[PDB]
C-alpha cells in the first residue's frame, strides 16, 4: 500500500515550466528553422564563459567526459547534458524495474515526465553546487559566497534552458532529439576545431599551431626539411597529429559500414496485394543509447569518486572507489585516476600504457563490452521496442508478414531482436575500444555517437521529406 | 565443472545466434554505402563548420570579456 510517488511529486510539478505542444502541425521548413535556432543558442551557451571564475590552471579530470556530455569547461555548459541524461537514465531504470509503477493514464504519464524533469533540475542544482564547493573554479573562501551563489544560479539557469530547448525539439517544434543534436554538434565542433584551429600554443621549442592541418601547412612552408616536418606533424607528441586525423577518418568510414548492416524482414499490407516493404532490423538496433547510458553512469561514478576523495581523504571506501592524481607531464593539467575502480574504468591513453598495464586494459575492455550488452538488453525491454511491441506497431499499421500471423511475427522478431541488440552492443563496444586505441580525434565513443546520431537524423529527414 | 558449463553454454548459444544474425545481415551495397557516407559527411561538415565559426567568433569576445 504505497502512496504513489507521482502523487507525492504532483504539487512540485505545477511549478515546473512546460512547453505547450503545437496546436497545428508545424511545416517541415519551420521545424528545420526551429532546430537551427535551438542549435545556435546551444552553441552560444557552449561558448559563453561563466561569470566570476578565478583563473585556475587546475587539472581537467573530465576532459574525455566533456566531449561526450557536450560540456565545455568554464562555460555556461560546464554541466552540459549530464543532469538530463542522468535523470532520464534513473527514471527509465526505475520504470523498467517496476519500483515506480507508471499508469497508462495521461495524468500518470504527465507526472512521470514532470518527475523526470524535476529530477534533472535537482541534479543540475546539486552538481553545480558540488562543482562550486569542490574548488574547481578556485577556493570557495577566496571566491566569496556571492560569486559562488552567482555561479550556481547561472549553471542552474543554463541547465533549465537546455532542458526547455530539448523539450521544445522533442515535442515536435524541431527535428529529432535535442540531446542527440547537441552531442553530435559538440563532437563535430571539437573534431573540426582540432583539425583546423589557427590558435598557436607555445611549446618549449617553438610556437606550434593547434590545428593539425594548419600546423602541417605552416611547417611545410617554413621548414627546409619538408619530409622531417611532415613526419613531425604525423607523429607530434603534444598536438593533434595528421596520423590521428587519418585514423579518425578510417574509423568514421568503418562505423558507417557497420551502421549499414541490416536484416530485412518482408512485410506485406494485408489490405493491398503486392505491396512489399522491408522491416529493417539494424545491427545497432538499440542505437547509441547503450553508449550514452554507460558513459553517464561512468561520469557519475567519476564525479562521486572525486568528491569523496576531496572531502574524505584516506578512507578505504574512497580509495576503493578511486584515487586521483594531477599529472602535469609537459601538458595541460589532467587528473587521472591512478587507483581503484575509477582507475580500472578509465581508458588507457595509448598502446604503450596498455603494454605497461595489461590487466587494466583487459578489465576496461571486458567492462565496456559487458556494460554495453547489458544496457542494450535492458534498454529494449524498458523502451517498449521489444519484438512484441514491434509486432503491435505493425498490427496497428496493418502490416502483416507473408504467410505468418501476427503471433508468428512476434516469434520471428523475438528470434532476432535480442540477438541483434546484444551483438550490436558488443560490436559498438569493440569499435569504441579500437578507435580509442587508434587515438582517433574526438574519441572512439564520440565518433560513434556522432556517426550514429547523424545517420538517424538523416533517416528522420528522409522520412519526413 | 558444472559452473564452467553453466557459464559456457549461454555464451556458446550467444555466439551461435550472433553468427546467425551476421549471416542473415544484408551487407550494404557500395552505392548505399556511398550515399550514407555522403549524407553523414554533409551533416558532419555543416555542424562542424557552424561550431568552428561560432567558437572562432567567441574567442576574441571571450578574450575581451575575460582578458582585462
Amino acid at each position: 500500500m504505497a502512496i504513489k510517488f507521482l502523487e507525492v511529486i504532483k504539487p512540485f510539478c505545477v511549478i515546473l515550466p512546460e512547453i505547450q505542444k503545437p496546436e497545428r502541425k508545424i511545416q517541415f521548413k519551420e521545424k528545420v528553422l526551429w532546430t537551427a535556432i535551438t542549435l545556435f543558442i546551444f552553441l552560444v551557451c557552449c561558448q559563453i564563459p561563466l561569470f566570476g571564475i578565478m583563473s585556475s590552471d587546475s587539472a581537467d579530470p573530465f576532459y574525455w567526459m566533456r566531449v561526450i556530455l557536450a560540456s565545455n569547461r568554464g562555460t555556461l555548459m560546464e554541466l552540459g547534458i549530464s543532469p538530463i541524461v542522468t535523470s532520464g537514465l534513473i527514471m527509465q531504470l526505475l520504470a523498467g524495474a517496476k519500483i515506480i509503477e507508471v499508469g497508462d493514464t495521461p495524468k500518470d504519464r504527465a507526472l512521470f515526465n514532470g518527475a523526470q524533469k524535476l529530477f534533472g533540475m535537482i541534479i543540475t542544482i546539486g552538481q553545480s553546487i558540488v562543482y562550486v564547493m569542490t574548488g574547481m573554479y578556485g577556493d570557495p573562501s577566496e571566491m566569496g559566497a556571492g560569486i559562488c551563489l552567482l555561479i550556481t544560479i547561472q549553471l542552474f539557469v543554463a541547465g533549465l534552458i537546455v532542458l526547455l530547448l530539448d523539450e521544445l525539439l522533442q515535442k515536435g517544434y524541431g527535428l529529432g532529439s535535442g540531446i542527440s543534436l547537441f552531442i553530435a554538434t559538440n563532437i563535430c565542433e571539437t573534431i573540426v576545431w582540432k583539425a583546423f584551429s589557427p590558435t598557436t600554443v607555445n611549446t618549449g621549442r617553438g610556437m606550434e599551431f593547434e590545428g593539425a592541418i594548419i600546423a602541417l601547412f605552416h611547417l611545410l612552408a617554413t621548414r627546409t626539411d619538408k619530409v622531417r616536418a611532415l613526419r613531425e606533424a604525423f607523429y607530434r607528441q603534444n598536438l593533434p597529429n595528421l596520423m590521428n586525423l587519418i585514423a579518425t577518418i578510417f574509423v568514421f568510414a568503418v562505423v558507417i559500414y557497420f551502421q549499414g548492416f541490416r536484416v530485412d524482414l518482408p512485410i506485406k499490407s494485408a489490405r493491398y496485394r503486392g505491396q512489399y516493404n522491408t522491416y529493417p532490423i539494424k545491427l545497432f538496433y538499440t542505437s547509441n543509447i547503450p553508449i550514452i547510458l554507460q558513459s553517464a553512469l561512468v561520469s557519475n561514478l567519476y564525479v562521486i569518486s572525486q568528491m569523496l576523495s576531496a572531502r574524505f581523504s584516506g578512507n578505504l571506501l574512497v580509495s576503493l572507489l578511486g584515487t586521483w592524481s594531477d599529472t602535469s607531464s609537459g601538458g595541460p593539467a589532467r587528473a587521472y585516476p591512478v587507483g581503484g575502480l575509477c582507475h580500472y574504468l578509465s581508458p588507457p591513453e595509448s598502446f604503450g600504457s596498455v603494454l605497461e598495464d595489461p590487466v587494466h586494459a583487459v578489465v576496461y575492455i571486458v567492462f565496456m563490452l559487458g556494460s554495453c550488452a547489458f544496457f542494450s538488453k535492458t534498454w529494449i525491454e524498458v523502451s517498449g521496442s521489444s519484438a512484441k511491441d514491434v509486432a503491435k506497431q505493425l498490427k496497428e499499421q496493418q502490416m502483416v508478414m507473408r504467410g505468418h500471423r501476427e503471433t508468428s511475427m512476434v516469434h520471428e522478431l523475438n528470434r532476432y531482436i535480442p540477438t541483434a541488440a546484444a551483438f550490436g552492443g558488443l560490436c559498438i563496444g569493440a569499435l569504441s575500444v579500437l578507435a580509442d586505441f587508434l587515438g582517433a580525434i574526438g574519441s572512439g565513443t564520440g565518433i560513434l555517437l556522432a556517426v550514429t546520431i547523424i545517420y538517424q537524423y538523416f533517416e528522420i529527414f528522409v522520412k519526413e521529406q | 565443472m558444472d559452473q564452467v558449463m553453466q557459464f559456457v553454454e549461454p555464451s556458446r548459444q550467444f555466439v551461435k545466434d550472433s553468427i546467425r544474425l551476421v549471416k542473415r545481415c544484408t551487407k550494404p551495397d557500395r552505392k548505399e554505402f556511398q550515399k550514407i557516407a555522403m549524407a553523414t559527411a554533409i551533416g558532419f561538415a555543416i555542424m562542424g563548420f557552424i561550431g568552428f565559426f561560432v567558437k572562432l567568433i567567441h574567442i576574441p569576445i571571450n578574450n575581451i570579456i575575460v582578458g582585462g
Binding site: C45, F51, I161, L168, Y173 | V66
Partner: peptide, 29 residues
Amino acid sequence: VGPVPVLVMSLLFIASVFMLHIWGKYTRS
C-alpha cells in the same frame, strides 16, 4: 510556456550574463 517565450528567456539570460561580465570589469577597474 510558448517556444517564443522560451527563446526570449534564453536570449535575456545570455544578455544578462554579458551585462554581468561588463559590470564585473567596471567594478574591478
